[PDB]
Write a protein that binds this ligand. Structure first.
Ligand SMILES: COC(=O)c1ccc2c(c1)NC(=O)/C2=C(\Nc1ccc(N(C)C(=O)CN2CCN(C)CC2)cc1)c1ccccc1
Length: 312
């Protein structure tokens, strides 16, 4: 919205990602990329499955995901893709994020080489295993490839470790949701920012507010109503993700259209109830994540230590 704002005294401010350095150690020869099918495409950017010759081991090739722009992209999009590469180069490597493997910044359009996660996004994975879920396995043949409570607990734990990594790098996600979590071999979940590769206009999970489209049902109140995005507001989005996880990919606040009454109810203390398969101690974490006071929400470092005792 382009309007007036009354302000009150309360810090952190975004950095201009174009000012971040790009380390050319990530430069990978473009001629060693063999492109496959497009995995997903936004309005201006797309992620393509590809084969990278000698990227990690000089002997053999490996499947990777290459993030690139469409022909319709303008100079601002090309700057944005370069800034996304500069952020990934800045953050460093962690197991629970979609990591940067290389980049092609020469001899053509910019190609960002990321890890390929064979299972896709966690949201579609959960909704696919809905009829194949049991809390724990009793004859094991009947639950061959079943999803269990052990898996969901590991997912909550890995996403929390990934977010804890981002917070330690002074990085705010601002769009934490199951659709932005990817699953790869060994049930490893990886956080990522789709950025230019998700078409926000065609996704009902992003609500048209003014001129912007925001993931309202995942956002903390101070984000929706005060435009305040912090480490603590990410924790709110993690609580909404937990509700997705233990409802097996159900849309949050199911059956509630986003309108003025919805915003009012959230401000007055309205919260979702416990998912059907959520353990009690995990739902406790949800309620703390959804505290209207950002000071009373747990940090991701605390969430990691909390879930760790549950795993053990
Ligand atoms: C910063 O990094 C990023 O921003 C980023 C963004 C997306 C991906 C990524 C990095 N890394 C991946 O791997 C991504 C996806 N990968 C994938 C894998 C498997 C599938 N599935 C299940 C298929 O069936 C498709 N596919 C399987 C393999 N055969 C050969 C071809 C058909 C679908 C998507 C994917 C992309 C679009 C939307 C959701 C996820």
């Amino acid at each position: 919205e382009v309007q007036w704002k009354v302000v009150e005294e309360s810090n952190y401010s975004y950095i201009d990602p174009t000012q971040l350095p790009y380390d050319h150690k990530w430069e990978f020869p473009r001629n060693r990329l063999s492109f496959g099918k497009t995995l997903g495409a936004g309005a201006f950017g797309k992620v393509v499955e590809a084969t990278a010759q000698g990227l990690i081991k000089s002997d053999a090739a490996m499947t990777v995901a290459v993030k690139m722009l469409k022909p319709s992209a303008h100079s601002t999009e090309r700057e944005a893709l370069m800034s996304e590469l500069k952020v990934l180069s800045y953050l460093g490597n962690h197991e629970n994020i979609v990591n940067l493997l290389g980049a092609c910044t020469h001899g053509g359009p910019t190609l960002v080489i990321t890890e390929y996660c064979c299972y896709g996004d966690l949201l579609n994975f959960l909704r696919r295993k809905r009829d194949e879920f049991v809390p724990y396995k009793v004859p094991e043949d009947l639950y061959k490839d079943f999803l269990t409570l052990e898996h969901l607990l590991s997912f909550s734990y890995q996403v929390a470790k990934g977010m804890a990594f981002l917070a330690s790098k002074n990085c705010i996600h601002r769009d934490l949701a199951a659709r932005n979590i990817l699953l790869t071999h060994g049930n490893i979940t990886k956080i990522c920012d789709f950025g230019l590769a998700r078409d926000i206009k065609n996704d009902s999970n992003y609500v048209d507010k003014g001129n912007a489209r925001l993931p309202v049902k995942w956002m903390a109140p101070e984000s929706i109503f005060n435009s305040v995005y912090t480490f603590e507001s990410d924790v709110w989005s993690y609580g909404i993700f937990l509700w997705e996880l233990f409802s097996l990919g159900s849309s949050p606040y199911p059956g509630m259209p986003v309108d003025s009454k919805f915003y009012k109810m959230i401000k007055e203390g309205f919260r979702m109830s416990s998912p059907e398969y959520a353990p009690a101690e995990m739902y406790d974490i949800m309620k703390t994540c959804w505290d209207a006071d950002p000071d009373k929400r747990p940090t991701f470092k605390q969430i990691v230590q909390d879930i760790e005792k549950q795993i053990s």
